[PDB]
Design a protein around this ligand. Structure first.
Ligand SMILES: CCCCCCCCC
Lengths: 74, 78
């Protein structure tokens, strides 16, 4: 269990207002940024450059912000 | 398993912030595509007074299965 906080560079936008992200990880998570910049003479492909997400196991509950979103993975 | 596109209701906001300090570009918002191996819940949380306690408001993510993908988007892989 052990709720972990996502670094402030990765936040959720809900419609807008942007919220910190808390993870209740039951399964590992991956994050890839996709862009259509693999360009041929007629087509274009997607390149998946993975994003490194710094996660911090929440030390004490009093570190939690006043409002945030919680992503729970079974 | 399969791929689901989350509507612009929910999107991921990435802030580079830097190798010069930008600090004025702010966040860049990308549509989310999910590669669910196991299901995902998303609850908004707000602090309610106890003294320690948070008011969890659920959020219905209306993900749509593709068979139409934008040029820029992130892929959440579980
Ligand atoms: C780094 C955690 C990303 C949060 C996943 C977004 C799920 C939206 C339904």
């Amino acid at each position: 269990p052990a709720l972990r906080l996502v670094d402030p560079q990765i936040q959720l936008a809900v419609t807008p207002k942007v919220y910190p992200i808390i993870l209740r990880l039951g399964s590992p998570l991956s994050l890839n940024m996709a862009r259509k910049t693999l360009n041929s003479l007629e087509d274009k492909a997607f390149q998946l450059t993975p994003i490194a997400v710094q996660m911090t196991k929440l030390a004490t509950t009093e570190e939690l912000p006043d409002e945030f979103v919680v992503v729970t993975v079974k």
